[PDB]
Amino acid sequence: AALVVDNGSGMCKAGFAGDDAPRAVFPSIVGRPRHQGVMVGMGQKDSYVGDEAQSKRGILTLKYPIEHGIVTNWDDMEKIWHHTFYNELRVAPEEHPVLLTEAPLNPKANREKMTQIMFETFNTPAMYVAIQAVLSLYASGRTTGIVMDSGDGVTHTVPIYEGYALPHAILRLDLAGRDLTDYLMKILTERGYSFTTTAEREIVRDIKEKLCYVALDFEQEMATAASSSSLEKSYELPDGQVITIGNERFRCPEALFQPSFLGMESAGIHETTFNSIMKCDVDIRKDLYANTVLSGGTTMYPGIADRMQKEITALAPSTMKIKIIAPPERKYSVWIGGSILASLSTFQQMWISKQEYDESGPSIVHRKCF
Amino acid sequence: AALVVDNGSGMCKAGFAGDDAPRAVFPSIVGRPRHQGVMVGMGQKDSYVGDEAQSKRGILTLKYPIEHGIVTNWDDMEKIWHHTFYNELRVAPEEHPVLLTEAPLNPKANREKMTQIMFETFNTPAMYVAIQAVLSLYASGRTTGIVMDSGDGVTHTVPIYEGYALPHAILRLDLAGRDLTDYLMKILTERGYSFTTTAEREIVRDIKEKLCYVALDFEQEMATAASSSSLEKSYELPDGQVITIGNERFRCPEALFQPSFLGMESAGIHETTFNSIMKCDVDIRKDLYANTVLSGGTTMYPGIADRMQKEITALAPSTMKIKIIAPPERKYSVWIGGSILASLSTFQQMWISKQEYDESGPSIVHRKCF
Amino acid sequence: AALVVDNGSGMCKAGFAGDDAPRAVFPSIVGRPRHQGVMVGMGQKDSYVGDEAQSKRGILTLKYPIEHGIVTNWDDMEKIWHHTFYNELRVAPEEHPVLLTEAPLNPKANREKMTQIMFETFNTPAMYVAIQAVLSLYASGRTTGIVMDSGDGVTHTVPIYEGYALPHAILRLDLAGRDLTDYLMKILTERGYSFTTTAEREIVRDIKEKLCYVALDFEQEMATAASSSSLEKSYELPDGQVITIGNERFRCPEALFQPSFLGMESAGIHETTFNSIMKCDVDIRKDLYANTVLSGGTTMYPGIADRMQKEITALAPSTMKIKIIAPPERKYSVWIGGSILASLSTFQQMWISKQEYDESGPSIVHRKCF
Amino acid sequence: AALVVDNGSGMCKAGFAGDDAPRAVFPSIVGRPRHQGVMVGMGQKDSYVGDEAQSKRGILTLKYPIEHGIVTNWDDMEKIWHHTFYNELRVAPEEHPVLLTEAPLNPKANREKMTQIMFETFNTPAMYVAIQAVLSLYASGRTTGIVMDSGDGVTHTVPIYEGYALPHAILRLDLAGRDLTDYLMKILTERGYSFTTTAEREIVRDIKEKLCYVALDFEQEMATAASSSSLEKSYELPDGQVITIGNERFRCPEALFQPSFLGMESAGIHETTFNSIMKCDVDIRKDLYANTVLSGGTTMYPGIADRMQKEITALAPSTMKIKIIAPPERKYSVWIGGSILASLSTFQQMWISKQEYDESGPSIVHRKCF
Amino acid sequence: AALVVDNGSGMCKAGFAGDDAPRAVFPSIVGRPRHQGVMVGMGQKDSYVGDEAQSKRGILTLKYPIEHGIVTNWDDMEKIWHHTFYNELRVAPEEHPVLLTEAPLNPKANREKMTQIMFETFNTPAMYVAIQAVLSLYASGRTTGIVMDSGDGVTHTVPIYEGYALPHAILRLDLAGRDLTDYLMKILTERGYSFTTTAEREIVRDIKEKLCYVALDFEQEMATAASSSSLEKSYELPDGQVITIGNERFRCPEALFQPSFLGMESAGIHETTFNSIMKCDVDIRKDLYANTVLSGGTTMYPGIADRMQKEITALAPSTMKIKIIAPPERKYSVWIGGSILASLSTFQQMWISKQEYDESGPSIVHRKCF
Ligand SMILES: Nc1ncnc2c1ncn2[C@@H]1O[C@H](COP(=O)(O)OP(=O)(O)O)[C@@H](O)[C@H]1O
Ligand SMILES: Nc1ncnc2c1ncn2[C@@H]1O[C@H](COP(=O)(O)OP(=O)(O)O)[C@@H](O)[C@H]1O
Ligand SMILES: Nc1ncnc2c1ncn2[C@@H]1O[C@H](COP(=O)(O)OP(=O)(O)O)[C@@H](O)[C@H]1O
Ligand SMILES: Nc1ncnc2c1ncn2[C@@H]1O[C@H](COP(=O)(O)OP(=O)(O)O)[C@@H](O)[C@H]1O
Ligand SMILES: Nc1ncnc2c1ncn2[C@@H]1O[C@H](COP(=O)(O)OP(=O)(O)O)[C@@H](O)[C@H]1O
Ligand SMILES: [Mg+2]
Ligand SMILES: [Mg+2]
Ligand SMILES: [Mg+2]
Ligand SMILES: [Mg+2]
């Protein structure tokens, strides 16, 4: 059975091809103690990975080895893959082909190191790197559509028509979930809440996932939040302190549609999706308008599909049918699509075998993987 | 039952002799993917023919194997004939004689390859190549008249009197529907509309067939279009964008009467028809003036019969009766005339049999076919 | 003295007729602040034009009012002309006739607005719009030749024989310098370099002008770049960071010859030039082969004249003499040719006077200007 | 004449706009007796403010109403402003507009209460709240530069380019002078010196301001202090006892560059300044490197400008010119810049008038003040 | 077998590692005769240590060599260690490694002299100095918790999470048992009881240990003691005189929670514990609230655990579970934890050997001991 490992900037989702859900989902973090150990005879490790790092984060410095879809610390990235194979899935990676994922328009050295580490460190028999948005279209059972995938590091749009990708129409924004977490940390200082440490950034991320939503009309929502407390929500911190937030609930996700909130010059996710459709041939735009697929954890805000539909309807001609497909399990669409792809019989010759790697080096990944 | 296949530059019209209409009408196009397929397990063909190429044209490069009535790509021409026999008519061509059509003054190697491919690739029992304008006179139930046939590639005039053709009076213009489509693409840039791809040329062809017409007086029509918006028409593109055109509606078909719009030195279709009549003997010109038959898709513009009558009346003596016969089904006159010819009992000895081809080679077509 | 203003998509070149070089050359950009001003009493303007926008681009959003040779923002286009007349040339435009330039096959409303703004906003006494490629032939001292002009927005070919243009043989590609800048930005992500803002696009344009070149044989050059670092060059960014590029140096200009690198279906500049020659009469093709003139900033790549000569030699018959004329000042050939034309005594009746505009409206430009 | 009041966490600096130095500088403290008064007929007040609290601190409990730039005791903050207006400046605040200062990224309720108290308690005619680091750039006579302001409560960096602030690049550390005073109190216990009361914290602050300095190389300085007594300095306590300190002189300011000395996870002031520059557009970083301005009392350590230059030079590219501007009066740069701003004629419409406050409430400060 | 010696300000607790209780517990006192000896031939020593000094205190001046956890008389401290080794434990210290204890935030010269005296005076083979509160967490079998240790000289709080100490959150009060003994001596003068000598201070300490308790509500207890004699207790002095005390029973321990009773400005032990928890990361505070461990003789007052729980519950958020762990043998928790630590196999490399001391001097203790 093939292994499907979806390494996003924030989460590692791993499991077996053929299953309908990942067997292991844990934060893609490595934590190291920032204090001195005074207790002799206690099992204190040098570093912690995943859920252990998250539960001990009070005395750790948390580090993400992946930033904006790009591995910035390959030693910590090996710790996460080792944790994935031996502690989470409890398999020997030298017996299973591994399907990995990547965002488009990434540095070429990123997937070359992924290939080298899989074959030389873990000794995988076969290996493949797929594009994340392409896998989301597999999960939706479609061959035509434009996928807007947004996770913790990258937001990218890939239009596909009749199984053919339009690479010149692929767009990528380095604005995603981690930028929204940092923006929420900033605007929480307006109410006197101070979150600064890496452990406190994990608390703000949990606040964002529980209380934030996308407003259908931002200016009308700002006027509603300024006239009453009907939008205020409370949240209990780990130490029992209760914080209350109002318009920050929808101002944080609003940066997806107005990146100028972050000082960015780029277009919002609605204009990025529309611009990607407009870079495609005129004869396929109607089918892309009707098959706009949302994917990733940053698309899980309540109200984001209705807002995307409203914004793209305003940009597109009035005779086009704008249909935003936001399945309830779209947080795992990339993994589910990879599980489908790695199980296809027509895919079993697409693997990069160990023999091909031995006779071509890590640059084989550029010839065999899109 | 004999098969009647009318291969024009733009459309393939096929059916059975004895019927009154073609059973299969599809564009004479072969489309090939110009992007990379990223969807595994999907039925993606290497090339698409006819209506499938037209519906998938957003990701294809469309190619016409016939240009100006001459086959320029014999491998793609076999794909179209194979699509015609096995997918459209769903017959075995080795059981039916096939009647093919051709424009006059074509290269001799064109109909020799048609003969070789019919007998050696499709194994037809019998075969024949007829002149397209002669078949149009069969469809009109006449034995005297001059036929002006204009399709997508060729415009040609053939005068016939009492069943005798006057070959020295046959004229041919390489100006037809595809040149008008390219001219409309050019003059649409004046309003800021940019059509460049082969798929967008199919959109402009559809605009031409729906909105273009022939003005009775061109200069008066240009003054009318410049003083009001009564001639403006709108058209919705496949992606919902609406374009508006004014004098381009009649400037595009005007190139048929003023080929200098295209930079050509040749005479218009009205002067070509008149010059063909004047090359005939004086005693038959009166009957040709009264039996001017229009044929082909490029004669389907509204107002072209009234314009042809007005222009030829100005060229001919005032005592001649100019009568332009433009039947409503003249887009299929060549096929209908071929269906009539292939059903005649006096035609059953005109076929080129397999035995005659085996003992004479493909050059037999020059002895048995006019 | 007449003013000669060459408004390309990227640069504005202005000066006086009779001079041999433009007196003012500045980017055709308008920049607006995208942050909030916190310094009271400082001379902060609402918008910046030209060189001021380029030096302050760190806090501006840069906008080109001309895209693909077509003015898309007429309010910003007036700012550039006002900057040209009053700040760069320091003249009163109501005392000088103005010669403007335009690409062929442009929307008719583009040169009508140019005429209206020159006469009603700047009150010019006379005015004229010339075709850019025709002016390049004036600068080369020829009356016969085909000019391939390629700037920041448009690539167009105009064949001229004995002073007569062949308008049906004029070709135009919407592929030029700005598309190459955007393509270089895309392929720089392969090495991990991220350029996204409008200010960073100006940095990539400077990288392109300093390090990019045209390979004589692309596939051989790709093999050379893959076997050693002899083609690698370094470039220091404004903040001191040094980037290194290898095969991107010649892959970016290669899109001129292989537009499929950009997802375009069009032919390269070599095939466009050859197709334009083949649309001309057979008797003039030999003189066009020997007088192929390159013009514009996008023809300034090292090695492009040798590549054009090699590619057209492969397309043309072997007995033709292919001669590519690439003068060292061909970046200013359009302006130099306009300076020559506006100084001719036989041109002084070709001007559109204020009286003719008052009695005919802006549509006078279609009667008096080619 | 406008009043300029710079309320830092530690000191209150007040004076008149147009002057070059504050007229009143006193500690921002309120002291209350912690013993029982036994002397009848003596003028014993209920609380003491400023210099009186500092001279009677032996029998008082000293309280700072501002902690980390945030007012935590608004009743004591009114005592300090009342002391400022009526006892120090000896003016009637209802006759003068008041310019106040604040650190960036403060709670919004902090400047709303400042506005309400100024208009309702002191009845000021006009009022304004400026950012402290922006005022320091006024004092240096610059419109471009990054200001690192560090007082008793807050360290913050504000980059400004051509008079435009980059708010997304503003960084703030809750590590400043009071944290260094508490750290010195802690490491003085290593030599047996015990300072615990609020009055003794004022003694340690005086030790810090007289004997502490920033080492150019910390590890080399630690080795020098461990091999001889050349770095030892003595200090006489108020009761005549003499203490001697060695490496504590530079270990206390070292916490600015290594906040892990305090158990903090944050970056040092050198990395905070560098990270703020790196959040800015690439085109402005060179000017920020050359115009790094130090401001506040915590930047008054001997050797801090040379250490900042050495640390930022190691972080920045080697071709950048790192220039640390540390003027000798940088302890009053915020006040001096406020005196300059409040005197500008272009600032006289930036005031928040009493009429605007009456029709908008204290929330007017968010619309009119950055 | 290792020796475990817990030298507090008041008591010396010594024994063997591996045992569950100290073998020798005696007062850390040295007594010297203050009268003239008139009896010849009687065994009169020059000084008395421990229990002998306590039984002869009528004719001695008693001196504590340790004050507030700091050795103030190193000659008398050697007498106590000599008494410990040779008279109480009856061992040769040159054959056993010795584990010593110390309060945190002590002068560095204190543990350096402990190291020098152990290696040079007693010739111990190995030696170690542990923090007292850390040893109390060993005795409770925990790796997470905040220990409030209070003996005769020092009260200190050390928070520990997963075996990691948070040194920046360690707090220390110089308010402990000896300050309460002196305060009881002072308030006993209100009833006419005069205790002044060092021998009489030992009597008051015995009164405190037998009759004093912590009131749950101090003001309610003061009203109960003022309305009846139900709280009065009697105590017989060594000479048969009987004293009676009422509210002094709970006013003396109340100084632990209200240090202003002693003229101190510091916070009570409940606020010190809470402030130490609040200096820790937010993610560990919940576990510290549930694992507050009391240690030392000053925590042996009846009712102190219920009072600590009530006071910390009022300070902490209402959703936190406040659990005060007060084991019945918490007077020996430091020694019991040292006996556990010195017996661990993972501790046998933590010893400071004689070789390490010979090559590094007494400053070795700062590198090897926390
Ligand atoms: N319910 C939710 N609402 C908003 N954001 C969410 C939600 N769930 C997850 N996220 C965000 O999605 C990001 C990661 O999404 P995901 O695509 O699952 O992982 P990765 O980015 O690692 O591929 C995180 O930044 C997280 O904050
Ligand atoms: N209604 C119409 N008006 C104008 N042109 C038409 C119309 N219908 C078809 N055409 C043109 O006729 C050309 C093809 O005509 P036809 O004779 O049917 O096919 P072929 O040229 O292949 O024999 C095409 O170029 C098409 O644009
Ligand atoms: N030396 C060079 N090499 C390559 N490209 C260049 C060079 N100089 C200018 N260009 C490109 O030429 C384009 C503009 O050329 P030009 O014709 O001078 O202006 P315009 O297009 O505005 O008429 C720009 O996109 C620029 O990047
Ligand atoms: N010469 C000095 N050396 C070191 N620190 C100083 C010096 N002078 C003042 N400070 C520190 O600066 C802090 C206050 O600085 P300042 O900016 O003037 O006031 P505020 O923080 O109230 O705005 C105090 O903590 C003080 O200890
Ligand atoms: N039952 C008790 N109640 C109150 N206080 C006590 C009790 N027992 C001992 N103490 C006090 O504890 C202090 C010493 O405690 P301990 O921690 O055992 O010794 P050391 O302080 O020397 O480490 C003495 O001041 C003593 O008065
Ligand atoms: Mg993802
Ligand atoms: Mg036809
Ligand atoms: Mg140009
Ligand atoms: Mg300050």
Ligand SMILES: [Mg+2]
């Ligand atoms: Mg103790």
